């Protein structure tokens, strides 16, 4: 999309993390070229309405979130089943201001100021 | 299981002379020849 100023739109900081986490969760695992492990297996977890499939979904979501290097940890908050519809919510703790500051100021020695994670 | 049930109390005996009179009650054995069953579906919601 466009930024309204005739240049390509850009997401930074928290918006960037949102974009990347959404894209990873939405991407099926193994579909992306040059990256077998990037993605998620949620497209196959459209199973029955029992706690077991709920736990499978939760474990897959935690795996997908942990796969990101910037995500220090993730954990379940609450979930419920309404027949067809599943609903859940998670909590994601990105790396703290102190760690990011230390990382960027260390990067001054190399001058790359870029991310190849 | 030739008979269903019987109450022991009802077994009363009268004896007089050469005659013996007995009363009893017995629930006859029976065999199933009809089954009617009703099923009801209900929603459920699970949490945590």
From TrEMBL, chain A:
It comes from the Viruses. This is Baseplate wedge subunit. The chain holds residues 118 to 234 of 234 of the full protein.
From TrEMBL, chain B:
It comes from the Viruses. This is Major tail sheath protein. It comes from Staphylococcus phage 812. The chain holds residues 540 to 587 of 587 of the full protein.
């Amino acid at each position: 999309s466009t930024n309204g100023n005739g240049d390509l739109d850009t997401v930074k900081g928290i918006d960037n993390m949102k974009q990347q986490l959404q894209a990873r969760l939405l991407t099926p695992r193994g579909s992306l070229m040059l990256h077998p492990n990037y993605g998620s297996d949620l497209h196959n977890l459209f199973g029955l309405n029992i706690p077991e499939q709920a736990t499978l979904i939760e474990m897959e979501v935690l795996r997908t979130l942990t796969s990101d290097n910037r995500v220090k940890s993730a954990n379940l908050i609450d979930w419920k089943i309404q027949g067809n519809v599943y609903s859940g919510q998670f909590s994601v703790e990105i790396k703290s201001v102190e760690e990011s500051i230390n990382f960027v100021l260390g990067q001054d020695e190399e001058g790359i100021f870029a991310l190849f994670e | 299981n030739e008979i269903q049930d019987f109450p022991a109390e009802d077994v009363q005996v009268i004896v007089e002379g050469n005659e013996a009179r007995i009363s009893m009650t017995v629930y006859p054995i029976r065999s199933f020849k009809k089954i009617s069953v009703s099923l009801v579906y209900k929603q459920q919601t699970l949490q945590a």
